[PDB]
Structure 1
Amino acid sequence: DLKAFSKHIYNAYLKNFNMTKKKARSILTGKAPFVIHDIETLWQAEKGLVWLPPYKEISVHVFYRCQCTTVETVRELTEFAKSIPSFSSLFLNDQVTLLKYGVHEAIFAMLASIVNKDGLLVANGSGFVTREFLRSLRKPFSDIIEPKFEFAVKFNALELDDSDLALFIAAIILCGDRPGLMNVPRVEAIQDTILRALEFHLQANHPDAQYLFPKLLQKMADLRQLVTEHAQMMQRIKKTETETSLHPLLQEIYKDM
């Protein structure tokens, strides 16, 4: 039962995310992606080696590739969530509310899967963008990406696997305290089932792990703070970078944060 619940969640995760952490870990270790570390390699990646609104400048261009990637992850997360029968039993507007406030927490948790201390995979693992290059970007674009790295490196210490991640992200999305939910008790009851499924699953999958479940609850709290700070950087970019186009779906997500 609690196993059939988790296994259903794990299959919805494999069914919907192109890049698993297993796939990613193969590539980052070497079982190779074109490395983008400066303007020249970026241009080469675009010419066809690895790959939008009208061009503006390099730092805005990278930001657009960020937007394109996160919009795609939002689409996958939505399909993943609709593939959870309990999620799909909420009223559609509550489903949207959960996604609105949950996807970025889930995106920054999943980002850890494709990152190491030196950069991150792009374009389905065919490119690799260095943390160095990202840091070099014009402000404020260089400050938005670096904190995700700090979180991702500590997060990867936990050494979760894809079966853990599927339950963790389900728990991030099925969150009872999002503003404007209609049926708080029903969502709270679903979240509780996922959390018990998670503790159960971690018991068997990480038998020697001390304090992993509470450590993961703290990561959920950490992700909430990451996304609050991220949304503050986005609102500032909206005010001061008026030439930078902002994808409409992402504008709706950030409207009231």
Structure 2
Amino acid sequence: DPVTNICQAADKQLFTLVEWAKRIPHFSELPLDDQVILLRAGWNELLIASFSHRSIAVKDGILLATGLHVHRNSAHSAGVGAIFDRVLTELVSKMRDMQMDKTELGCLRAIVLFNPDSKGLSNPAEVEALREKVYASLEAYCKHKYPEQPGRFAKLLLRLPALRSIGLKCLEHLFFFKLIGDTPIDTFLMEML
């Protein structure tokens, strides 16, 4: 039975995301009220950046880490279809063409996560500092693992605006609910024949 099952999926992700977050250095040292404000500011961008890198192994689809590999369908609203198209055009194919690595991707999420602009933060400035340390390390990594490509660090950071646009649309069209929840709903409805 579908809806409760979908709630189970939401809970599982976002406990996982909070688990990832706990393992980032210095996130826990932050005031508790802060840690929440950051997770709420960033849950969508952090998820999309993940579902997108995973999906590198797939041609034309999104892959959920339950192993479900998801596609655009006929009866989707213009909006949902467009989010699919944007994930692939602006994120997955790029992460792919450049062969973005997991260290690099993790660093990007940590930068996304440590957002000094998130509203209500007790100390905005020491988020900015942690955001600076992370990206500084990411620069150094890029400059060492791939020194032939001097612009790679920037190219990574400049995927961040797109994450923002997509993150906003995904909030708008309920993209997560319909990713996790499309198959269980449609499949249940087919115990109506």
Same fold per superposition (TM over 0.5): yes
Among 61, 69, 72, the alignment partner of 1:128 is 69
Question: Which residue pairs with 2:118 in the alignment?
Answer: 178
* Aligned counterparts of 2:118 and 2:153: Cα–Cα separation in 1: 22
CA deviation profile, 1:106-144 (whole Å, cap 9, x unmatched):
11111122223322334533x433x3xx23233254444
Identify which of structures 1 and 2 has the higher relative contact order when contacts are C-alpha pairs closer than 8 Å and 6+ apart: 2
Once superposed, what is the RMSD of the aligned Cα atoms?
2.8
- Equivalent residue number for residue 206 of structure 1: 146
Query: Which amino acid is 2:3 matched to?
Result: P
1:53 lines up with 2:22 in the alignment: no
SS of alignment partner, residue 121 of structure 2: coil
Structure 1 122/172 Cα, relative in aligned 2: closer, same or farther at 3 Å? closer
In structure 2, the residue matched to 1:10 is none
CA distance in 1 between partners of 2:76 and 2:43 (Å)? 26
SS class of match (2:66): coil
Seen in structure 2, the aligned counterparts of structure 1 residues 69 and 53 have a Cα distance that, compared at 3 Å, is closer
Structure 1 moving runs of 4+ over 6 Å: none
* Alpha-carbon contact 1:121-1:128 (below 8 Å) kept: yes
1:119 and 2:61 matched: yes
Note closer, same or farther for the CA distance 1:208–1:83 as it changes in structure 2 (3 Å cut): same
Structure 1 residue runs of 5 or longer lacking an equivalent are 1-51, 55-63, 238-244, 246-257
Residues in 2 aligned to 1:224 and 1:213: alpha-carbon distance in whole angstroms: 18
- Provide the residue aligned with 1:149 in structure 2: 88
Residue 189 of structure 2 is matched in structure 1 by none
Matches within 5 A, 1:1-257: 52-53=2-3, 71-115=11-55, 116-122=58-64, 124-125=66-67, 127-129=68-70, 131=71, 134-139=72-77, 141-151=80-90, 152-234=92-174
- What is the deviation of 1:103? 1.9
Structure 1 residue 78: Cα displacement: 0.9
TM value normalised by structure 2: 0.76
Give the TM-score normalised by structure 1.
Answer: 0.59
Q: How many residues align?
A: 173
Distance change (3 Å), C-alpha of 1:216 and 1:122: closer
